[PDB]
Amino acid sequence: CFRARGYGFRGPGLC
Numbered sequence: 001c002f003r004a005r006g007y008g009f010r011g012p013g014l015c
Contacts, residue, residue, distance in 0.1 A: 003009030 001011030001015035003011070004014045005011030007013030
C-alpha cells in the first residue's frame, strides 16, 4: 500500500 507496498508496513502483504 505504502510501506507495505514493499510489504511489512502498508500494502501487498497488508494494503
